[PDB]
Amino acid sequence: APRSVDWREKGYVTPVKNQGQCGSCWAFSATGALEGQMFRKTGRLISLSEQNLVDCSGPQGNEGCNGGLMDYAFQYVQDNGGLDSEESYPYEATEESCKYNPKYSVANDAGFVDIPKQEKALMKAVATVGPISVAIDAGHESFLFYKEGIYFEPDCSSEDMDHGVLVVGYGFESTESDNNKYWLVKNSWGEEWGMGGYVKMAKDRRNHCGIASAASYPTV
Ligand SMILES: O=C(NCc1ccccc1)[C@H](Cc1ccccc1)NC(=O)[C@H]1O[C@@H]1C(=O)NCCc1ccc(O)cc1
Numbered sequence: 001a002p003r004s005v006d007w008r009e010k011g012y013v014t015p016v017k018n019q020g021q022c023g024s025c026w027a028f029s030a031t032g033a034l035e036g037q038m039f040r041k042t043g044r045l046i047s048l049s050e051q052n053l054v055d056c057s058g059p060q061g062n063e064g065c066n067g068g069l070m071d072y073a074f075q076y077v078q079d080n081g082g083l084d085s086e087e088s089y090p091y092e093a094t095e096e097s098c099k100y101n102p103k104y105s106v107a108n109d110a111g112f113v114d115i116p117k118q119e120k121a122l123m124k125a126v127a128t129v130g131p132i133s134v135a136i137d138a139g140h141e142s143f144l145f146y147k148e149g150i151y152f153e154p155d156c157s158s159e160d161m162d163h164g165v166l167v168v169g170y171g172f173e174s175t176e177s178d179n180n181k182y183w184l185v186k187n188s189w190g191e192e193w194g195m196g197g198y199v200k201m202a203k204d205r206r207n208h209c210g211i212a213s214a215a216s217y218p219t220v
Pocket residue numbers: 022023024025026061062063066067068069070134135136137138139140161162163164214
């Protein structure tokens with residue numbers, strides 16, 4: 001297996017986005033994972049509509065700006081037979097009626113794959129598939145104010161995750177003394193947050209913040 005992986009250098013990853021004050025993290029994580037897999041299939045990177053998911057995927061069990069799950073989002077695209085582009089169905093950070101238009105669909109999937117709840121299994125997935133949707137425990141001040149380095153929060157929970165994000169890679173870092181391996185994570189709080197919107201999460205440290213507990217990707 002490769003010791004370092006960064007799917008951004010292969011063209012799989014769109015720029016960082018900003019969910020605003022809508023509880024839609026799960027839809028940004030989902031589009032991230034589907035953007036990657038659509039590029040792997042077609043070689044074309046096209047930003048996907050989170051508003052589409054927020055407004056339309058309630059029947060799959062999502063609750064708009066009040067929360068949701070990436071797997072439910074992947075299920076919607078399969079069930080719906082399409083998902084509109086970001087440009088055709090832009091993000092409003094509020095929940096509304098469904099405005100999906102199949103003429104502007106640019107993506108599809110055939111279900112999804114759940115990764116075993118093991119950081120070694122997530123490593124294999126990231127190395128061979130592409131960006132992977134994961135949930136983390138993000139409810140700590142240290143996460144809000146993160147700037148640089150490998151993020152480690154001693155009070156992080158591996159079993160009570162509350163924020164969907166996207167693992168685009170992993171690697172090693174010796175610029176810091178007390179930690180070394182990290183997962184490279186794309187967040188959805190804009191470019192001002194963290195390291196241009198990304199965070200290095202501690203890897204192989206008691207499944208830190210639960211990053212390997214709810215990992216999945218769509219089938220395309
Ligand atoms: O818990 C969740 N879903 C359960 C659920 C299921 C079905 C219907 C509804 C809800 C998910 C996290 C998840 C996703 C997949 C697997 C496990 C876990 N979170 C959400 O859907 C949004 O609430 C998150 C959000 O965007 N809030 C603002 C950002 C924020 C800021 C601080 C912070 O500490 C956390 C998040």
